[PDB]
Design a protein around this nucleic acid. Sequence first.
DNA 1: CCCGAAAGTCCG
DNA 2: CGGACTTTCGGG
Length: 231
Amino acid sequence: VPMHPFVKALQEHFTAHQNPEKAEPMARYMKNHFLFLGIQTPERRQLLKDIIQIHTLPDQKDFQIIIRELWDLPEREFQAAALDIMQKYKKHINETHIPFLEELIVTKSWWDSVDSIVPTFLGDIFLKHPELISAYIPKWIASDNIWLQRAAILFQLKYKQKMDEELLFWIIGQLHSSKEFFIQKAIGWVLREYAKTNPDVVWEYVQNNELAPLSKREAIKHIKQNYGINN
DNA sequence: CCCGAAAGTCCG
DNA sequence: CGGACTTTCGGG
């Protein structure tokens, strides 16, 4: 069965505007894990907009199908476009889509896709259905997959006052010994971000609990100004 | 415009 | 390590 015509149209239109010269450093920026067409975000969004203006957005019944097909295409701009498109179907996404989102996190995985999926899409779902957190987070933490572990750390990134502190610190405690850069950095990020809401709690945490040096210094990047740096 | 963030390199 | 910088993107 052929590619969805929307996807085919997107693929034709992107490919006609490819830039091999830009593609090389863009691919190097992602450690050469992916082929790139060499289209940066402002143009990529306009090209998508063009295809929607002509073909209209596919019926929601094809939403997951479109995302999968784009996900399977080799160049990274198609996963970036897939995430743009998924945003346009946001009001159709609910708790039943968590396994679908899991699957996106663990395929073609890198910080660009996972960071675009987790604090927004998964974050919003677990905010509305916090009782579902325990059906997924422990599995993610225990998995061999560092991107699921990073998802467990970052899904609360934007929660601000809705942050479950006990949960956040429990998750960090489970992952604080990881030697993985993307885990240490995620821990640093989520603490740095939460410190913008509750600096005292983050400060007390990092001064009294083991963290990778990277995690700690990223966490207190800003709030160290408020407490000072002891001799 | 600005700032802060993911990364990234380069250097001691 | 960790700081200083390159850098694209999102969000005032």
